[PDB]
Design a protein around this ligand. Structure first.
Ligand SMILES: [Fe+3]
Ligand SMILES: [Fe+3]
Ligand SMILES: [O]
Ligand SMILES: [Zn+2]
Length: 158
């Protein structure tokens, strides 16, 4: 479709915030209730469900504050850089946002692993099936969100 190579850091940052950050902040606020209900109704007979509320919660958290770092601190440094402005600290700023991505990543591996690649049992209720659906979706979206930053946005500045 549109080759991101032509997008300058400024625009690439904008797209990421309109396509990935903003839609995700809400997705959580809308998905979290369902993930909590599942660990109360079915957690007792299915421990993995209790383990996921946790993982999901700690993922949501890591992702929520890692995204808010990119908006309150790191994107400015990135646009600053594109405008040939002395920043000096960007080399490591990228190396922190890269690690942050590996962290929030292995967490997506566990959730998939716990959910048996998001494949419900024979006893999954609608909510259960719905959660798995919404969750699997939240995995690929962020996989696109992170890939874009890693292999395009960050590489531009480099
Ligand atoms: Fe981001
Ligand atoms: Fe990020
Ligand atoms: O992110
Ligand atoms: Zn079972």
């Amino acid at each position: 479709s549109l080759n991101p190579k032509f997008l300058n850091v400024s625009s690439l940052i904008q797209y990421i915030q309109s396509a990935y950050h903003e839609p995700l902040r809400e997705e959580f606020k809308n998905l979290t209730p369902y993930v909590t209900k599942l660990s109360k109704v079915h957690g007792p007979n299915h421990p993995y469900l209790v383990e996921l509320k946790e993982t999901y919660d700690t993922f949501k958290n890591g992702m929520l504050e890692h995204m808010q770092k990119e908006d309150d601190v790191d994107f400015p440094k990135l646009i600053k850089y594109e405008q040939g402005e002395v920043v000096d600290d960007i080399n490591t700023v990228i190396d922190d946002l890269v690690s942050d991505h590996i962290a929030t990543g292995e967490l997506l591996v566990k959730m998939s692993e716990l959910t048996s690649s998001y494949e419900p049992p024979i006893e999954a209720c609608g909510t259960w099936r719905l959660v798995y659906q919404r969750l699997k979706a939240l995995e690929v979206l962020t996989h696109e969100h992170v890939h874009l930053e890693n292999h395009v946005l960050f590489k531009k500045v480099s």
